[PDB]
A paper describes a structure:
DSR2, a Sir2 domain-containing protein, protects bacteria from phage infection by hydrolyzing NAD+. The enzymatic activity of DSR2 is triggered by the SPR phage tail tube protein (TTP), while suppressed by the SPbeta phage-encoded DSAD1 protein, enabling phages to evade the host defense. The protomer structure of DSR2 revealed an architecture that consists of an N-terminal Sir2 domain (residues 1–298) and a long C-terminal helical region (residues 299–1005). The Sir2 domains of two side-by-side DSR2 dimers contact each other to assemble into a head-to-head rod-shaped homo-tetramer of DSR2.
Then, we collected the cryo-EM datasets of DSR2-DSAD1 complex for structural analysis. The cryo-EM structure of DSR2-DSAD1 complex unveiled that DSR2 in the complex also forms a head-to-head tetramer. Interestingly, two DSAD1 molecules were observed to bind to the C-terminal regions of DSR2 on the same side or opposite sides of the tetramer, forming a complex with 2:4 molar ratio. The surface view of the DSR2-DSAD1 complex structure revealed that DSAD1 engages in simultaneous interactions with two adjacent DSR2 protomers, and the primary interaction region can be divided into three distinct interfaces. Furthermore, the superimposed structural analysis demonstrates that contact with DSAD1 induces a conformational change in the overall DSR2 structure, which may lock the DSR2 in the inactivated state.
Author numbering:
A (entry chain B): 336 to 494, 504 to 565, 577 to 634, 644 to 898, 912 to 1005
B (entry chain A): 12 to 491, 506 to 631, 644 to 670
C (entry chain C): 9 to 33, 38 to 55, 58 to 74, 78 to 119
Amino acid sequence: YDYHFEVNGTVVRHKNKGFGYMERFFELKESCDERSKLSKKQYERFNALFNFFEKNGVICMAKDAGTLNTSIEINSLAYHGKYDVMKKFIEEQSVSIEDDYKKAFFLACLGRWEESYDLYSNIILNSIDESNGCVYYLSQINRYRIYQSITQAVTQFNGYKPFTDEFLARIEREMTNFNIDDLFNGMPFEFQKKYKILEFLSDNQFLYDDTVKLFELTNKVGMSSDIVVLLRLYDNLRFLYENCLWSVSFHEFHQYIRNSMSLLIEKAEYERTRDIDELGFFMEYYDFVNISRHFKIDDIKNLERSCSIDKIRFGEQEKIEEYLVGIAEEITKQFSANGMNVVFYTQFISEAKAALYFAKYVKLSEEGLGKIVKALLFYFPERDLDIGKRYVWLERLTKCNELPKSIISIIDDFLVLQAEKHIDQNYSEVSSNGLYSRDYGALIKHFEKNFISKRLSEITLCLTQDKQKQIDFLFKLLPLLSTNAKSHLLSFKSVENINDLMNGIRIGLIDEFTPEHEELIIEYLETRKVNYIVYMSTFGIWYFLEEINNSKMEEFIGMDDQYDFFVDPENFDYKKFIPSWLKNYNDKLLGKIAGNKHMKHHVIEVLKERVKNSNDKRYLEILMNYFI
Amino acid sequence: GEKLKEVFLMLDNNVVECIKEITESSRNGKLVFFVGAGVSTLSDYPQWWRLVDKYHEELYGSPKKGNYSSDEYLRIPQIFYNVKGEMAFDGILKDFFQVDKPTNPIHDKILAMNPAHVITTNYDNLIDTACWKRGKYFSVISAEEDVANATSSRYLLKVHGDFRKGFKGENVVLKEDDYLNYDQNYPLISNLMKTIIATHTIVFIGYGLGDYNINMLLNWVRKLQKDSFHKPFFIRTDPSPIENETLIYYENKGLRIIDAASLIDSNEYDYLERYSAVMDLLIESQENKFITKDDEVIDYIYGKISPLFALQYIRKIDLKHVFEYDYHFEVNGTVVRHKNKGFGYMERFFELKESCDERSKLSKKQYERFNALFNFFEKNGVICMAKDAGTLNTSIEINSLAYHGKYDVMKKFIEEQSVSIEDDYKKAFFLACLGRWEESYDLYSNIILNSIDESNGCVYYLSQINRYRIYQSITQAVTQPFTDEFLARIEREMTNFNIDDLFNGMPFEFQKKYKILEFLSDNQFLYDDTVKLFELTNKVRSEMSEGSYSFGMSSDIVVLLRLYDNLRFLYENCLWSVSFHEFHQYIRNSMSLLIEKAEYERTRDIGFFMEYYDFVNISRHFKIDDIKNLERS
Amino acid sequence: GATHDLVYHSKINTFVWDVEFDIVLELNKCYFVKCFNPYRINGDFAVSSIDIFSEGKRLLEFNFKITKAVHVATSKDVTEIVLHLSERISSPFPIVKEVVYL
């Protein structure tokens, strides 16, 4: 309870009754002449204390400032991913017990919990005799942390056996009464005052202080509180990762980082959008790593549905590119041959899903997007990310960047690969969205519009009439293949199917109105009249956008009011048009309803009425963007 | 499991009493085990007779004719030490005692009885390294200067020494030679042994009745006075059942024999199951699987809830810490089960609460205790468990005249004469609220001086805490009214206050019964519901961007009822720490995010109905600018 | 009586709630998911795209007169409420079991 130590490296005085000793320290630090007048041993001690306070960033007091810069730098290979360097660093021989300590933490990170437990126990057994019991004490703490980790691994994953039941019974035999609360208060007299500050490491809910500081960033507030909480955040991460603490992975910490950059991004949203009156948070590499690692996929989605992150600028794009190329490369090595360590799998897949979700806003390069898209489509596993959500992620990636030729070639390789997996007539094509491989075709038809498939054309040329699903997969992806191929599978056609090939145009038949089929539409409307006398809006929409040229659909008006609503807009009574009916139209179709004259005059009244009723803002956003 | 249940059904009366006193002394944190060789040799540790063998055949040649008597176990190696030499003696000790034997499983359960100290007569590294593995610290003492470095308050008293400082015969008591003049070489381990023995509950496990250590101790306690010492316990695990006469005799010298051969039916070389028979009979008594009938459940609740008959209102987060990591107590009054290994005692409590007929079949005194526990749990709102619900209603009601303003009634309540020290306590808090800090300080000091003699030290402890709180209040008042006589007097008397060990200086009764009040000696105990507010961040405040009229129960009612739990705690227990900035910070941000989430709830159309208590909270804990900020948000 | 799970997801006017349909459009064990892609490339002109399951895709014709709906993990068929919410909402597919929100 001496000098307050601030979050920028400045020191202010508080409750120090006595000589200003930090003040004489900094004055002796500034001028060299007073620094000279001293004996040898404590000049060396001054060099040591000097190296300490420059290493922790603690600089001269609040009397002199202006050059206050905080370049944060976590120098640890467990923060930057660096997993192949981590394994490489494991296999060498140790020379010290500190090397044993870092190797234990690294090996604990990449899904290997047993050998890190044993190496922890080796540090306990081989440092108890030697002084400075911090490495010892931290080893004990971390050994219990990894014990809780392993028992969490049999708490969840048995709800495959990751560890053998010899080890799982041994540690449960030896660690099942652990009461850490008096561990530090059993340490010697030296380790009860010198390292008395480490007493929160025998607990977990020590996160309370900066958590309440986040509530200042709630409590409804140059230099703001943002830089305070951000630098205290980086103080926390640099503590738990550079001191190699295993308690960084427990849920309270991810809770804290989660909510921390939640409220920082929400406050930058509440900062630049102050422009009622007159008319921030610049991302770096560490913000990208924190967003990818501590958030979840749904939470980044929640940030996108709360704060406009498209405004938020991004810097240091090359190191972020190294993190994404590294993360995709480690996906590639994760599923090249083997190595499916289920522990490391669950962690690394959560990070890789979140990072590839957040990689939309990043200005990637040529070969970077090459390795990322290749590892996303080919090597990236199922049962977490399926083939529809790879259009979510992939189309998310392949929209902000102008698509190079090689990327379309790789997606073509994916389509050929899916055709080669449609050679078995049991291929399910599972999808948790409803999006399928035809959308992959639509992607290539969006960014190239003139793409002729070559090897897929060769597959359709050697296509045999014994594999129906294979043909179907060649038949949904229809506008990609050559003309002789078109002769081949357009021979494989059934034209009497009115409303399969319609019902969802499942093959992409919107390429042509082959005129007997539009006369088929017409005679279908005759059959509607026939089974009247005593889905459908799509027909009407196909009249609305000047696509079918026959007009006698006005004869078939009288069964569906939406049919009248797209065929004869003038004579239809705009007083019983249900509004519902508009939350299910595309932007183009709503744009073309907005492009009329007698339509707009009434739907502004009904839509403004339903907006005016309680709070409907789909109708107000459509009303402010399409209809206005 | 069931076998030991039948063992508990077939115990003698004095045996059951001994299981009670060992168990409650384990619960007090005062239970010192004096263990021996028979515990350590089931880890296959080499006993002393093998060394009398090897030192013997390395002395005389000529292996033993008949058998050794008592003194030869000390005499023959002594011969070796005097004649053959130091290095040969220490070399043979170095050979036989260089073992890396694993631990006996009863070591796990000795260290699972929460011992205060562990006094041993062993020479190994089993109990201590087992204590390093089980995350406790016992002060491993094996020398004179090891006593001076008493690094903790939990002692592992190796009274004979240890081979930590090398395998040297100088370091341990093995020769005769050290049993002769033992009161001249280890005077301080002697004094500490007498100290720990006289001030605890001592349990003898691994010995023979007539072993020389026990003979020395019985000599010393028979030199002591007779009203003063606690009679220790002797757990006898021998192959032979003890006869009655030596039992009665060793009851008269001061020990209490719990036999193990008479409880089970075991073999001759079957030591381990007999040790584990008695030791599991103690552990399962802690874990209360021996609790079967009405008078056994209704007391174990009572023995933890009758302390809290004094306080006005207890939170439902801390009531989890009453029944230590048992049943989760939810914020609506429901109880779900978690980590309770043993009889469902709350379940029998609520079933006895529902039907009157089972409620009838009980003795008088604990039917009255059931009425008391019943009045408690209805007063704190704790109702029947999660099996039956639907009428879950939470009508919050802070019945305090410091919450509703009521200032003229407060002054009126001040000027009457007190009849109790509780009336003194409420008058002190009320008078503290309405700007009168000096007389409330003096009345606090009156409660400290006039309740220290009387039991149930909660009112005392809370008075101390609140006196320091009002001291911080007054020094805040001269930080940012009072005469400089008072302002120098309290600054004279309260300027070294370190509250962190105040509760850990309270008696043994006030260290477990009111152990849940330990956060009141701190301030940043607001952490939990603060992070729960961040659930109301973490985007179940997602519910705007997708239309969702989700009809059910959200996190809003959870955080709101936990908020009202907090306010009802700090105002009905008359705590002065309600006025410090962290609490206004918490209520501030709490209804900030509740109102912001109701804003993020009804505007999902791509709630939060105010009552009186919401109006009072908005007026009191917000500021003017913050209510303006809520209107502009 | 499963109103404690019934939502009214109203960007697309659905009722996301796990039932299991038995339809005649004759089938058994049908459940529905719906999309919300208003930026769908070349995929008709509608945002919502139903993806009817019959333990896998039906490969879809359509009269959808539901015969038997039953709520998962609490039984006693909820068919009257399914007809009532079918009567109120004039849209395709009132009871959808999941929503993607692209």
